[PDB]
């Protein structure tokens, strides 16, 4: 069972320099007298990590109080302790540290390790009641008061311990690394004895790899569990705990970096270079031997002309009648505002085949023009509106360039458009003399000759009429069922945009390098005050051809030409 | 309403030479001292430009008429005007120039632009009545006679005046171009003084855009709206019209060409090149800047070997003997020529129920095998060939599967099986046990067992034969009459194939550089005569393995040698 | 709202005459076309005849030589002169609109031919 402590009162952080330290193995593989670069979590070289007395007496009267936080977990930590009496006795990590999610519990004992992952109930200051037979004092008995209870057990493992024993200025330095990479939890450690340093001492030791859990569970925080050599019912004046915390514990926090190791004849790395740290050691890495970047944009300029008129999609995709798939529904859209997540959010369309545009980002494109096509298909025929398909519909009706881009939409209606008796208001081609070119419409109702004999605009024996009706009524199957069909193509041309996306223009800023989106023209670069005239007609600029150099602002008419943001 | 003028009279024809001019501004890009090369429809340089007067004064007794044609309208127009009493007024742009489809009206009065879209019916002779005020004088009134009524107006534009007021050798020269490309009628203008030069000017002006209309109809012919200043109630001796016609306009017609535009320092299009007017030109669009290719067939040859082996389909539809509906004769067609032609060009038959194969492109497919089925049936069961269908014989005869790739064919056969006394010989079943398996060919005579006693192959009570006889007569109905019926099902299949299309060759042509298919060898060359000798079981011939330098030509026998077309 | 109205129908004995009439108001655009279409009981929707705006006149095998279309330019309204009416011609007929994409549709009238 827990037992309460006093209040932490937040004391104030403190930090020290950690001079190359936190250098694991990141690999099993033995390489001799070589330099190897490697990118991966490592502790960035002469960092300030954070560090915590294991005992504090800071209050006048003289406290006693452990100072035990709950830190961040952010992508791995390197925790060192220098102590002398093995009062750090483990870790504790999770997302809540209580019974709602799972967390991990790793404990020393004078015997072996402890490990386990459970449902586990932490109490706000665990810790581990260290006490001495009257006998022997050879090992210490610990009585845990970490958790209230635990559940939904799923891992336990023991093995020799983490920490050797400490039992007089023979301090020791235990430097570990966790990382929690691919659902296991990798441990990684090293001791050194260390003499008359207080803080990290200055040198290299690598940290050889200990051990790998397949965990495979979610850490974000973490906590030191320590051993309380005193009493909590009777606090003693001083001296019953340990020298006041003389042993502590340093707290640094992985990063993402490139290091340059170098494995001596043995195998074991003797040194290692901080790509990041200072140019002398970019230098040294891009040598690989031991002897435009200043400018980024900040902010985000969108600017689109003043348009509020909402584009007529209900008046085709909410229209009560559709035109037949010979002659077919053609309506210019223009000079509004589009929506388009009411239609991609709104699901009652089959098909969503997008061409040239993904369908999340049609609010984020700005178009010369939409052209909107209303259709009644079959089901079965709805795979032919896309281009490059062949077919009646896509052969003899409506042909889809191979170069389309704008979005086909194809929804049922068969309590719309089907009747009883069958609806026969759609007339469909089953033959033609030839093939259609893309976007083009014939609605000739010449009678065609199927044999060597002119029809003479009169059917027969091989003269049929073009047009067959459709069996649609409320009985057909899904494929003889109507659908619904409407293609939104986008015109997307070196020509100012009429219709638009539910944007937001913001303010200009000028003369600083900035992510700009002018009328739907997006890149980075600088803006200044440009001399060139521009006839009216004209929108862009480009005097080399193949970058814009100047731009018109849509709302102010002045002209601003873009200086790439590179030097 | 509209006016009735003279006959036109067919004034011949009277051209001029375009020096260079109606070059436009093809983008909407700001350039600055650079060239750029655009493919676009431009007027060709030193072209043929077809000039008329506005009034032609031309008959003996000095007759004073408008020389206003309907001219085409081929993929743009330069239009340009030479004038300066604003007589030229605006077009009218359509292909019937009716009721019938819409035309697109642009016309200039004093003060704006009208321009409409509409259902004009247009008059022969379309004009503007320009009378002055009898105090001001300093503006014309015009009363419009160019269309007797307008409907369905889908558009309408006003703006500042096209043309600006002319009100004495100040002549101007006013230029436009019209394009009608993806429903976008795109008007280019340019305004310049001009001095004591009757024909178009000697220089370059560059056409900067004027407006783009989303008028989106049709147009192949156009005309031009002149004003009469004079009355045509009374028409007066001289000097009642303006100067006998000295202002006058030229028409000329875009091509697409490849110019080569520069731009000046201050963005202005100064000179252009022409890439096709003269190998100069040529040259400096290839260089882009300002300071084997011959021969192509022409002819197709196509040369393959004999149609020998041909079908015994007259075996098979010119048969005198069709067997039993119920012995069905099914017969092999295999290794032989095809021609289907003959039987789908002569159609003497009276079906041609092709399924999973259109009947045209029978002969250029060749397939592995041929099923022939022949039998003679009654007309009202004609119907019940093919698959999914159901009936005596569908059911109970002959199960034609879903998913047939074949041709069912009967014609009348009336004058052939049918006898006076009624032709007994084809014998039909109406009882069975069950339905079918497609194909299957039941010939057994056993009496089937309608009650629930057995037969043991004796009629009686509830105990009949198979097979009853049909009364085929020569003066029974259509529906009782004899119908021959052939059943051709074709199988593709991953096997070769046996039975192949009448492959059709045609002439030879030698010495001259053609298109040639030599037994499915395709290629482009001239042929010439060889003295190489191929052993008899060798056709091409490779002298340098990866080129055919010789063929051997299917029909006749002779060698040719293929040199290639490019010299 | 185009509407198209037809009218003329009724009974009529075998070898009679009759004259159908529909008028298309409304945008109908002026590139049109014009048809009719018969329906009897328990069959289809035969297509009988089109016309277009350029004075073609189209007619199936059924009714060869017997009925003919007349067309009013001036009100843009159609007639069918339905002359040797037979008893196969007992169907009712509609007006088809094609119009430029909205396909329009009558209400019909009723021809029955018998004796």
């Known amino acids: 069972q827990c037992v309460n402590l006093t209040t932490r009162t937040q004391l104030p952080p403190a930090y020290t320099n950690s001079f190359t330290r936190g250098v694991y193995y990141p690999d099993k593989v033995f390489r001799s007298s070589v330099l190897h670069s490697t990118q991966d979590l490592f502790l960035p070289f002469f960092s300030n990590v954070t560090w915590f007395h294991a005992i504090h007496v800071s209050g006048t009267n003289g406290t006693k109080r452990f100072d035990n936080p709950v830190l961040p977990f952010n992508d791995g930590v390197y925790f060192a302790s220098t102590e002398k009496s093995n009062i750090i006795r483990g870790w504790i990590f999770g997302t809540t540290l209580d019974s709602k999610t799972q967390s991990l519990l790793i404990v020393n004992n004078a015997t072996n390790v402890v490990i386990k992952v459970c449902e586990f109930q932490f109490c706000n200051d665990p810790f581990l009641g260290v006490y001495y037979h009257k006998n022997n004092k050879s090992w210490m008995e610990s009585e845990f008061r970490v958790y209230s209870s635990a559940n939904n057990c799923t891992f336990e493992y023991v093995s020799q311990p983490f920490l050797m024993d400490l039992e007089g200025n023979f301090k020791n330095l235990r430097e570990f690394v966790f990382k929690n990479i691919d659902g296991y939890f990798k441990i990684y450690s090293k001791h050194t004895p260390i003499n008359l340093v207080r803080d990290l001492p200055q040198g290299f030791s690598a940290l050889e790899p200990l051990v790998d859990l397949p965990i495979g569970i979610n850490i974000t925080r973490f906590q030191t569990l320590l051993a309380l050599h005193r009493s909590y019912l009777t606090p003693g004046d001083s001296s019953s705990g340990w020298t006041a915390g003389a042993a502590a514990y340093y707290v640094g926090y992985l990063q993402p970096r490139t290091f340059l190791l170098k494995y001596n004849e043995n195998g074991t790395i003797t040194d290692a270079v901080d790509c990041a740290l200072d140019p002398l050691s970019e230098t040294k890495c891009t040598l690989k031997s031991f002897t435009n970047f200043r400018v980024q944009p900040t902010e985000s300029i969108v600017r689109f002309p003043n348009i509020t008129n909402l584009c007529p999609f209900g008046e085709v995709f909410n229209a009560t009648r559709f035109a037949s798939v010979y002659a077919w529904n053609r309506k210019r859209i223009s000079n509004c505002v589009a929506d388009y997540s009411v239609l991609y959010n709104s699901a009652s369309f089959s098909t969503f085949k997008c061409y040239g545009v993904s369908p999340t980002k049609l609010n984020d494109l700005c178009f010369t023009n939409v052209y909107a096509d209303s259709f009644v298909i079959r089901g079965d025929e709805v795979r032919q509106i896309a281009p490059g398909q062949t077919g009646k519909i896509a052969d003899y009706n409506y042909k889809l360039p191979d170069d389309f881009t704008g979005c086909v939409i194809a929804w049922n209606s068969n309590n719309l458009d089907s009747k009883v008796g069958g609806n026969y208001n759609y007339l469909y081609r089953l033959f033609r003399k030839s093939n259609l070119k893309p976007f083009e419409r014939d609605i000739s109702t010449e009678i065609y000759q199927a044999g060597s004999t002119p029809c003479n605009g009169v059917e027969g024996f091989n003269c049929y009429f073009p047009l067959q009706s459709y069996g649609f009524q409320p009985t057909n199957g899904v494929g003889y069922q109507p659908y619904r069909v409407v293609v939104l193509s986008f015109e997307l041309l070196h020509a100012p945009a009429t219709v638009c996306g539910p944007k937001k223009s913001t303010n200009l800023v000028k003369n600083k390098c900035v992510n700009f989106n002018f009328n739907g023209l997006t890149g980075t670069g600088v803006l200044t005050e440009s001399n060139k005239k521009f006839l009216p007609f004209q929108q862009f600029g480009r005097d080399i051809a193949d970058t814009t150099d100047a731009v018109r602002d849509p709302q102010t008419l002045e002209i601003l030409d873009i200086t790439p943001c590179s030097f | 309403q509209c006016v009735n003028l003279t006959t036109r009279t067919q004034l011949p024809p009277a051209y001029t030479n375009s020096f260079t001019r109606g070059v436009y501004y093809p983008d909407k890009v700001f350039r600055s001292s650079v060239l750029h090369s655009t493919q676009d429809l431009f007027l060709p340089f030193f072209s043929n430009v077809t000039w008329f007067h506005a009034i032609h004064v031309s008959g003996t007794n000095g007759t004073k008429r408008f020389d206003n044609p309907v001219l085409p309208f081929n993929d743009g127009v330069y239009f340009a005007s030479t004038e300066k009493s604003n007589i030229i007024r605006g077009w009218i742009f359509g292909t019937t120039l009716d009721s019938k489809t819409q035309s697109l009206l642009i016309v200039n009065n004093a003060t704006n632009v009208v321009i409409k879209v509409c259902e004009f019916q247009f008059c022969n002779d379309p004009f503007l009545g320009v009378y002055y005020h009898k105090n001001n004088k300093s503006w014309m009134e015009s009363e419009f006679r160019v269309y007797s009524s307008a409907n369905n107006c889908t558009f309408e534009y006003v703006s500042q005046p096209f043309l600006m007021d002319l009100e004495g050798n100040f002549k101007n020269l006013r230029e436009f171009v019209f394009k009608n490309i993806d429903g976008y009628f795109k008007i280019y203008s340019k305004h310049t003084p001009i001095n004591l030069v009757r024909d178009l000017p000697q220089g370059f002006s560059a056409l900067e855009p004027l407006v783009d209309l989303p008028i989106g109809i049709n147009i192949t012919r156009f005309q031009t709206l002149l004003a009469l200043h004079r009355s045509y109630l009374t028409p007066g001796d001289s000097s009642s019209g303006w100067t006998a016609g000295a202002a006058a306009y030229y028409v000329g017609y875009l091509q697409p060409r490849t110019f080569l535009l520069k731009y000046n320092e201050n963005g202005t299009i100064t000179d252009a090149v022409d890439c096709a007017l003269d190998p100069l030109s040529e040259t400096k669009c290839t260089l882009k800047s300002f300071t084997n290719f011959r021969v192509q067939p022409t002819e197709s040859i196509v040369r393959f070997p004999n149609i020998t082996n041909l079908c015994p389909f007259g075996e098979v539809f010119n048969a005198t003997r069709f067997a039993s509906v119920y012995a069905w004769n099914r017969k092999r067609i295999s290794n032989c020529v095809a021609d289907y032609s003959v039987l789908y060009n002569s159609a003497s038959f009276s079906t041609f129920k092709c399924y999973g194969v259109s009947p045209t492109k029978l002969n250029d497919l060749c397939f592995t095998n041929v099923y022939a089925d022949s039998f003679v049936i009654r007309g009202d069961e004609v119907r019940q060939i093919a698959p999914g269908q159901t009936g005596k014989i569908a059911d109970y005869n002959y199960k034609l599967p879903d998913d047939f790739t074949g041709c069912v064919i009967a014609w009348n056969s009336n004058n052939l099986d049918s006898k006076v006394g009624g032709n007994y010989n084809y014998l039909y079943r109406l009882f069975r046990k069950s339905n079918l398996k497609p194909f299957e060919r039941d010939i057994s005579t056993e009496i089937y067992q309608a009650g629930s006693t057995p037969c043991n192959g004796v009629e009686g009570f509830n105990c009949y034969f198979p097979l009853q006889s049909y009364g085929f007569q020569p003066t029974n109905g259509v529906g009782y009459q004899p119908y021959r019926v052939v059943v051709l099902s074709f199988e593709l299949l991953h096997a070769p194939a046996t039975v192949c299309g009448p492959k059709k060759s045609t002439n030879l042509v030698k010495n001259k550089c053609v298109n040639f298919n030599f037994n499915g060898l395709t290629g482009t060359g001239v042929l010439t005569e060889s003295n190489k000798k191929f052993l008899p079981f060798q056709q091409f011939g490779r002298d340098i393995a990866d080129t055919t330098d010789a063929v051997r030509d299917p029909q006749t026998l002779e060698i040719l040698d293929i040199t290639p077309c490019s010299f | 709202q185009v509407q198209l109205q037809e009218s003329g129908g009724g009974l009529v004995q075998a070898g009679g005459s009759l004259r159908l009439s529909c008028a298309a108001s409304?945008?109908?655009?002026?590139?049109?076309?014009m048809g009719w279409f018969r329906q009897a009981l328990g069959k289809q929707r035969e297509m009988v005849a089109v016309i277009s705006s350029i004075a073609s006149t189209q007619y199936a095998n059924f009714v060869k030589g017997r009925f003919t279309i007349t067309r009013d330019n001036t009100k843009n309204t159609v007639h069918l002169q339905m002359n040797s009416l037979i008893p196969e011609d007992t169907a009712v007929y509609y007006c088809?609109?094609?119009?430029?994409?909205?396909?329009?549709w009558g209400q019909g009238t009723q021809v029955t031919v018998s004796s």
């Open positions: 409304g945008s109908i655009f002026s590139p049109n076309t």
């Open positions: 088809y609109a094609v119009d430029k994409s909205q396909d329009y």
